Design goal:
The complex is a heterodimer of chains A (335) and B (7). With 335 residues, chain A is an all-beta fold. Chain A has one helix spanning 157-160, and strands spanning 12-15, 19-23, 26-29, 34-38, 43-48, 54-58, 60-61, 71-75, 78-82, 85-86, 89-90, 94-98, 107-111, 121-122, 125-129, 132-136, 139-140, 151-153, 166-168, 171-175, 180-182, 198-202, 205-213, 216-225, 231-234, 248-251, 256-260, 273-277, 282-286, 299-302, 307-311, 330-334. Chain A has one domain (3-335). In chain A, a hairpin with a 4-residue loop joins strand 3 and strand 4. The longest helix of chain A has 4 residues, at 157-160. Helices cover 0% and strands 0% of the residues of chain B. The radius of gyration of chain B is 5 Å and the shape is elongated. Chain B has no helices and no strands. The chains are: A mainly beta (335), B little secondary structure (7). At the A-B interface, loops of A face loops of B. Chain A: Kelch repeats lie at residues 7-61, 68-112, 124-183, 197-235, 247-287, 298-335.
Chain lengths: 335, 7
């Protein structure tokens, strides 16, 4: 039980129900004074959900650049990775890693997708439905191609970064048979542009909660109907979790979403957990023993054994860069 | 730190 991944935020974690695959993210190197120290691109860490042990694999092939904020999912044992932030900025590249392989070395493949891709961006979300991947939102450059939806600049990026960036409300579909991008024509009122929101799919509903937009970290809840492309805003019956970004939102049943952690508008790291019951349209607080372990920019993955496995993220205000306390702890929630 | 902007 020696092996364990380095601490990190902004990594991805995806699951086949038995394994949790962890890639990427960043941490600090305090000796060198580096607070954007990306984790090694060729490493893939596998957390075995039954044994609680980690194994590090070195991948080959078209290994993606080291990145924070990428959007990944595992569908039928294939890892798909879109977007992110590397040392030279945001990307819209798409990578696949097929784990249905009896080869001893796992191989990344960079895919040349057809159609018009999303803009280059990070800190977004993805829904999975009927052999397609449906991406929503994010933070990145002004879109350069014809795109349906809206984009709003982050005002401070006109002086605080080398190139202006902003939030989008875009919905893009990738068909994984042909690797073709498209966009659906939606109806209803889409959520505002946002990044660092959390997405979760139950049935044909793509839920999205919270996120950052302009000067707010939000607590609104919406779903996109993945058959009809109608957006719906859900107004819960009572008290809601406070507005936040960098939280996780994970399906735990056919009727429940599990929310943990995040970062408030006033920059407080959060250790609260809640369950949203879909049929009752109500939020309920979830009692747990990690009240002194707030996390933001962690990942959460459900196991087949009725648990949510939280990994990584930052315990304190990650925007105070030199003091940001990234974690490598596994927090297990019994749901 | 560009990586954390926008969240």
């Amino acid at each position: 039980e020696l092996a364990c991944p380095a601490e990190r935020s902004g990594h991805v974690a995806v699951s086949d129900g038995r394994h949790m695959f962890v890639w990427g993210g960043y941490k600090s190197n305090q000796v060198r004074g580096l607070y954007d120290f990306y984790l090694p691109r060729e490493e893939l860490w596998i957390y075995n959900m039954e044994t609680g042990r980690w194994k590090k694999i070195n991948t080959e092939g078209d290994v993606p650049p080291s990145m924070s904020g990428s959007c990944a999912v595992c569908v039928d044992r294939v890892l798909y990775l879109f977007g992110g932030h590397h040392s030279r900025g945001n990307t819209n590249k798409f990578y696949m890693l097929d784990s249905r392989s009896t080869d001893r070395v796992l191989q990344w493949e960079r895919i040349d997708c057809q159609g018009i891709p999303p803009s280059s961006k990070d800190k977004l979300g993805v829904w999975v439905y009927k052999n397609k991947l449906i991406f929503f939102g994010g933070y990145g450059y002004l879109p350069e191609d014809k795109v349906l939806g809206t984009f709003e600049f982050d005002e401070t990026s006109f002086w605080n970064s080398s190139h202006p960036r902003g939030w989008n409300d875009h919905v893009h579909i990738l068909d994984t048979e042909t690797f073709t991008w498209s966009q659906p024509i939606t109806t209803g009122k889409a959520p505002s542009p946002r990044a660092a929101h959390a997405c979760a799919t139950v049935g044909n509903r793509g839920f999205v909660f919270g996120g950052r937009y302009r000067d707010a970290r939000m607590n609104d809840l919406h779903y996109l109907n993945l058959d009809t492309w109608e957006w719906n805003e859900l107004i819960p019956q009572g008290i809601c979790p406070v507005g936040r970004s960098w939280h996780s939102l994970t399906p735990v049943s056919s009727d429940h979403l599990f929310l943990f952690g995040g970062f408030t508008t006033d920059k407080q790291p959060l250790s609260d957990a809640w369950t949203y019951c879909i049929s009752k349209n109500e939020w309920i607080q979830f009692n747990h023993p990690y009240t002194e372990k707030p996390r933001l920019w962690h990942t959460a993955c459900a196991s087949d054994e009725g648990e949510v496995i939280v990994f990584g993220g930052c315990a304190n205000n990650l925007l105070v860069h030199h003091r940001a306390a990234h974690s490598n702890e596994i927090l297990i929630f019994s749901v | 730190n560009d990586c954390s902007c926008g969240g």
